[model samples]
Target: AQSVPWGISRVQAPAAHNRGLTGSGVKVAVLDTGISTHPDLNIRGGASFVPGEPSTQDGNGHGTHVAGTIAALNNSIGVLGVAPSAELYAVKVLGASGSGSVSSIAQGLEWAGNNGMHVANLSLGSPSPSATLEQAVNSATSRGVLVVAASGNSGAGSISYPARYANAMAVGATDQNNNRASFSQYGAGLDIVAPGVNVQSTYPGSTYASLNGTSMATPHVAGVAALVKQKNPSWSNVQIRNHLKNTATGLGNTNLYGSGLVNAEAATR
Candidate 1:
């Protein structure tokens, strides 16, 4: 397997320019492997949905890295997360090999909603679709929660499951040039694009890595969602979805990169 690239660096986080509020009031549930016991993560209401699995600690390391991108602490140590102060709820649906089922993912989604997650980040996907997953996402949206998922890394084909569902925002990966990553899946389901290729973020303890794929892109949207919820608590899930679509930088003509690359400054403002 390719090691995490060192091309990208976690830069100094700027002061809150868009809104005075950080993601302090928000709770984001990440449905993947459990995160490490980092002081930055909340980990208060997490549970594992992977069959008989007892813990949510990331065995594959992917989920741990993704979690870091969304909510790592900003105390002059590791990289500053997009929503550094937001709480995290880990729902481990996938195991060490990074594979799970629709049923498990659905259950995890329901769990997040029941636990009052303001936004849920789902960076995993399957090649096929599942009605169970769709219904669960619908339920989450109905409960005024936003769900963001990776569009997959196949580069072409129908957008991957969960992301293809209407209730979730499907995100594609963008390269350093702000163009779609070569491995980023795109289609009618593409909702937005984010920096993913060779992107730098925290991994497990004392480690940093550069990851690619829509898996990397999804959290960017999730982080932005936190900012959105912080700025306008009254915004409905639909409104939040629309704001992302409207504020996106147009990429390709037909769902090539959905609305376009997600501009954090524009989306937050």
Candidate 2:
């Protein structure tokens, strides 16, 4: 009764999961601080691009939290993610401080594309834009990898980079009542919305934690993207992207909510 997170049902993951669209056969890349060893998570293995960090294991717990929201295993123990049956590929672009350079991030995206990753989640973003990172996002998406990113926590008039770029899907944070989070970045470049406030998921040390921010919201879209990919194995990134946007539940403003709250069940349909 206490296994699944609130965001799971909030986005209608159970309806999709019940149909056996649990993100099987879809490879998802978590490009962040990396994923730590957790019983609730089933990692398919990954590599670290963070300089001086040879291991892909998570240290800051942010990446692990995001990964748990995307693909935590469906068992009797911990929480269930949107796509519990999906394959996870950890790409540690961010370092221990939960930050990284644009060059390393671009490299990580390219790696995910080359390695046949179907979806990549970028929960980290910068206020400043970079041509190299934009090109990497374009290149990855061109290679058929859907890039899901956070709109940022500024709650400013404009979203942050990477999410602000043309190729990426910018996700905003919403509460259980579908209210846009106060810290959720809005305005131009917004693509979708999902539950983020007080969201609970797997954490480091074989535990769990409830966190916030559009970073938490981003994985919800990535998980739905995985479900969409698994249901339609041959769908391109563009097709999956548009399908998610079109099938979302319209909440309110286009700037604040984008297409609306991302609906996993509708997306899988």
Candidate 3:
């Protein structure tokens, strides 16, 4: 009683999903607004880093949407995600307004690493770099957490930071047709691409939504990362990244597509 979204099919998530490698025992941290209450999502736990916001509830819906893409339950209703069984933890860095300071994000990254997260989904980005943010990303990677970040929305030559940072995996977006999304940023450090346009998944208020952005694409890679983690529990973040990059389907443009469309089936293999 589950439906597969187009994005899910494009990434070949079901191939791995059918094999019982559905993110079991993996921990993925959604570093965004926060994760709201929803039937399709299994939240292990969470923390708030946004200023003055003690509650780790997603009132804005952005974080929940991203989290849904990563691990929405494979249940009788609602859409299925890549790693439906992955443990989702909300690391609230951005507030309801979808805006936050670098310090908040840095703190969220630190928390993700210290709390035993296997992967960190960073759908938020800044055009400029912050020394503090860069340090945090490296710190998390050192702690054995894979950092996945959205390339900026600007159709520019360079991807944004902390995605541009060396340790973070920079993710760009492709439309349903597998072409580079007009808004997905490109250039150095951009590592991979995923479905991002009009992607449907769980939204706020226990409803659903179809949004467009590299932000939406980010969780797909994060979800797959979790699946990879489950498949090879002994693998480190570097090996996981290498396997994903080496196994991707080449889409003919390095800058626009990075290693190319993330192929979950191949990655899991």
Ranking by lDDT: 3, 2, 1
Q: Provide TM-scores for the models.
A: 0.90, 0.98, 0.98
Model 3, global lDDT: 0.91
Q: Quantify all predictions' global Cα lDDT against the true fold.
A: 0.76, 0.91, 0.91
For candidate 3, list the clashing residue pairs, or say none: none
Please report the TM-score between candidate 3 and the true structure: 0.98
Task: Give me the displacement of residue 216 in model 1, in angstroms.
Answer: 0.5
How many Å off is the CA of 244 in candidate 1?
1.6
Order the candidates by TM-score, highest first: 3, 2, 1
Deviation of model 2 at 91, angstroms: 0.4
Model 1: colliding residue pairs:
34-56
lDDT of 3 by residue, 1-269 (tens): 56788999999999998888999999999999989889898888989988767434887889989988898988898889999999889899999998999999999999999999999999999989999999999999999999999998999989899999989999999998899999999999989999999989988888889999999999999988888889999999999998988899999988788999999999987
Candidate number that wins on lDDT, 1 or 2:
2
Task: Itemize residue pairs with steric clashes in candidate 2.
Answer: none
